[PDB]
Amino acid sequence: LHKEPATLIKAIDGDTVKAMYKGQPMTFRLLLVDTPEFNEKYGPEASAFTKKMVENAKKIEKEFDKGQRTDKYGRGLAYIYADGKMVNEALVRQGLAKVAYVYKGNNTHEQLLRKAEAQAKKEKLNIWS
Ligand SMILES: Cc1cn([C@H]2C[C@H](OP(=O)(O)O)[C@@H](COP(=O)(O)O)O2)c(=O)[nH]c1=O
Ligand SMILES: [Ca+2]
């Protein structure tokens, strides 16, 4: 896969952000992860982690996988990087997201994220506490 530039409009919650994609404001949904909803346990924490990671970055980038680039809701589906660090992976590593929604042909970073999830589980972090 390859990274490409992204233009952040605003973070929304733990696993969605709003981006300007070819001049269209568009929600992007992070691939391979599920954060809690904002008013569920660890919701506000997952939101804040994603928000600070993308807002405080010098650069956001996105990376499409090989399959669907949009979901049934018109959301873009990507891996998002903040100054080269993958937000999807960081959330899982800190126990703020589960690996989830793994579909064949959009699963390039599956094993990387499962390695992070196992470490968060071993450390009993957040969701796994
Ligand atoms: C992450 C992801 C979610 N989705 C869909 C599955 C769920 O659809 P259904 O709503 O029909 O169950 C929904 C979960 O999104 P959220 O976790 O953002 O609520 O988005 C995809 O189709 N592909 C994906 O890669
Ligand atoms: Ca969610």
Work out whether the CA dihedral 47, 48, 49, 50 comes out positive or negative.
positive
The most distant pair of C-alpha atoms in the chain lies apart, rounded to whole Å, by 43
* Strand, helix or coil for residue 86: strand
Residue owning the nearest CA to atom 9 of ligand 1: 72
Contact between 116 and 92 under an 8 Å Cβ cutoff? The reply is yes
Query: Nearest to residue 15, comparing CAs of 64, 77, 105, 68?
Result: 77
Contact between 50 and 56 under an 8 Å Cβ cutoff? The reply is no
Give the pair of three-digit tokens for residue 46.
């997952």
Measure CA 108 to chain center. 14
Please list the residues that pair with 69 across neighbouring strands: none
Experimental method, per PDB record: X-ray
Question: Structural domain boundaries of the chain?
Answer: 1-129
Separate counts of helices (H) and strands (E) for the chain: 3, 9
Interatomic CA distance for residues 122 and 66, integer angstroms: 31
Interatomic CA distance for residues 60 and 73, integer angstroms: 23
Task: For residue 71, give the ligand nearest its CA.
Answer: 1
Interatomic CA distance for residues 31 and 33, integer angstroms: 6
Query: Which CATH architecture group holds 1-129?
Result: Beta Barrel (2.40)
